[PDB]
Write a protein that holds these residues in place. Sequence first.
Motif, PDB file in Angstrom:
ATOM      1  N   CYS A 104       6.638  -0.073   0.109  1.00 54.21           N
ATOM      2  CA  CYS A 104       5.773   0.324   1.265  1.00 54.21           C
ATOM      3  C   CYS A 104       4.812  -0.879   1.386  1.00 54.21           C
ATOM      4  O   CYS A 104       4.367  -1.632   0.359  1.00 54.21           O
ATOM      5  CB  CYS A 104       4.899   1.371   0.868  1.00 54.21           C
ATOM      6  SG  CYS A 104       5.657   2.782   1.018  1.00 54.21           S
ATOM      7  N   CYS A 150       6.872   1.410   5.365  1.00 56.31           N
ATOM      8  CA  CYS A 150       7.881   1.396   4.149  1.00 56.31           C
ATOM      9  C   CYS A 150       9.260   0.996   4.473  1.00 56.31           C
ATOM     10  O   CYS A 150       9.404   0.721   5.708  1.00 56.31           O
ATOM     11  CB  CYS A 150       7.722   2.757   3.370  1.00 56.31           C
ATOM     12  SG  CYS A 150       7.544   2.229   1.535  1.00 56.31           S
ATOM     13  N   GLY A 182      -0.606  -1.336   9.454  1.00 52.96           N
ATOM     14  CA  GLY A 182       0.271   0.097   8.970  1.00 52.96           C
ATOM     15  C   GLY A 182       0.918   0.063   7.984  1.00 52.96           C
ATOM     16  O   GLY A 182       1.749  -0.789   7.939  1.00 52.96           O
ATOM     17  N   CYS A 183       0.800   0.936   7.028  1.00 57.17           N
ATOM     18  CA  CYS A 183       1.724   0.756   5.786  1.00 57.17           C
ATOM     19  C   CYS A 183       2.836   1.538   6.156  1.00 57.17           C
ATOM     20  O   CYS A 183       3.491   2.551   5.971  1.00 57.17           O
ATOM     21  CB  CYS A 183       0.939   1.813   4.722  1.00 57.17           C
ATOM     22  SG  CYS A 183       1.167   1.269   3.224  1.00 57.17           S
ATOM     23  N   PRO A 234      -4.805   2.451   1.752  1.00 62.33           N
ATOM     24  CA  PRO A 234      -4.301   2.277   3.231  1.00 62.33           C
ATOM     25  C   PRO A 234      -4.663   0.444   3.465  1.00 62.33           C
ATOM     26  O   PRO A 234      -4.761  -0.217   2.491  1.00 62.33           O
ATOM     27  CB  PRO A 234      -5.320   3.133   3.946  1.00 62.33           C
ATOM     28  CG  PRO A 234      -6.442   3.141   3.192  1.00 62.33           C
ATOM     29  CD  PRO A 234      -6.162   3.229   1.634  1.00 62.33           C
ATOM     30  N   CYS A 251       1.323  -2.880   3.841  1.00 70.56           N
ATOM     31  CA  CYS A 251       0.442  -2.729   5.130  1.00 70.56           C
ATOM     32  C   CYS A 251       0.657  -3.957   6.095  1.00 70.56           C
ATOM     33  O   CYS A 251       0.406  -5.256   5.632  1.00 70.56           O
ATOM     34  CB  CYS A 251      -1.158  -2.929   4.543  1.00 70.56           C
ATOM     35  SG  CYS A 251      -1.472  -1.152   4.213  1.00 70.56           S
ATOM     36  N   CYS A 253       0.926  -1.095  -0.198  1.00 73.19           N
ATOM     37  CA  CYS A 253      -0.063  -0.016   0.093  1.00 73.19           C
ATOM     38  C   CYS A 253       0.982   1.405   0.070  1.00 73.19           C
ATOM     39  O   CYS A 253       2.274   1.076   0.060  1.00 73.19           O
ATOM     40  CB  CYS A 253      -0.878  -0.034   1.150  1.00 73.19           C
ATOM     41  SG  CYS A 253      -0.764   1.362   2.286  1.00 73.19           S
ATOM     42  N   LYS A 254       0.272   2.387  -0.257  1.00 77.16           N
ATOM     43  CA  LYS A 254       1.027   3.670  -0.388  1.00 77.16           C
ATOM     44  C   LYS A 254       0.448   4.491   0.686  1.00 77.16           C
ATOM     45  O   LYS A 254      -0.827   4.604   1.055  1.00 77.16           O
ATOM     46  CB  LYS A 254       1.232   4.340  -1.493  1.00 77.16           C
ATOM     47  CG  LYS A 254       0.389   3.452  -2.572  1.00 77.16           C
ATOM     48  CD  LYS A 254       0.815   3.694  -3.961  1.00 77.16           C
ATOM     49  CE  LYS A 254       0.018   4.806  -4.474  1.00 77.16           C
ATOM     50  NZ  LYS A 254      -0.785   4.583  -5.879  1.00 77.16           N
ATOM     51  N   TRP A 255       1.347   5.482   1.349  1.00 76.48           N
ATOM     52  CA  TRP A 255       0.597   6.673   2.175  1.00 76.48           C
ATOM     53  C   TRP A 255      -0.255   7.462   1.566  1.00 76.48           C
ATOM     54  O   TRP A 255      -0.878   8.283   2.079  1.00 76.48           O
ATOM     55  CB  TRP A 255       1.790   7.259   2.978  1.00 76.48           C
ATOM     56  CG  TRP A 255       3.021   6.366   3.350  1.00 76.48           C
ATOM     57  CD1 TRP A 255       2.826   5.085   3.371  1.00 76.48           C
ATOM     58  CD2 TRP A 255       4.211   6.581   3.937  1.00 76.48           C
ATOM     59  NE1 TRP A 255       3.791   4.392   3.981  1.00 76.48           N
ATOM     60  CE2 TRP A 255       4.821   5.590   4.279  1.00 76.48           C
ATOM     61  CE3 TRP A 255       4.941   7.798   4.198  1.00 76.48           C
ATOM     62  CZ2 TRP A 255       6.126   5.324   4.909  1.00 76.48           C
ATOM     63  CZ3 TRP A 255       6.208   7.633   4.728  1.00 76.48           C
ATOM     64  CH2 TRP A 255       6.699   6.818   4.933  1.00 76.48           C
TER      65      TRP A 255
END
Length: 48
Positions: free
Chosen positions: A34, A27, A24-25, A18, A36, A12-14
């Motif tokens: 990245c 990296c 919590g994504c 999500p 989760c 996933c990416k910030w």
Amino acid sequence: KKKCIAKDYGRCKWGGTPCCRGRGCICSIMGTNCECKPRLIMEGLGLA
């Protein structure tokens, strides 16, 4: 809360998708790789 990735370790990416389950994504602290992860927070360097 839809629009997320319930796949444990779901890339996933910030700024993109999500995590669903509540991951919590995290990296590589560099802006790449990245993903989760299933809520992980094990410290120790400060505990000892």
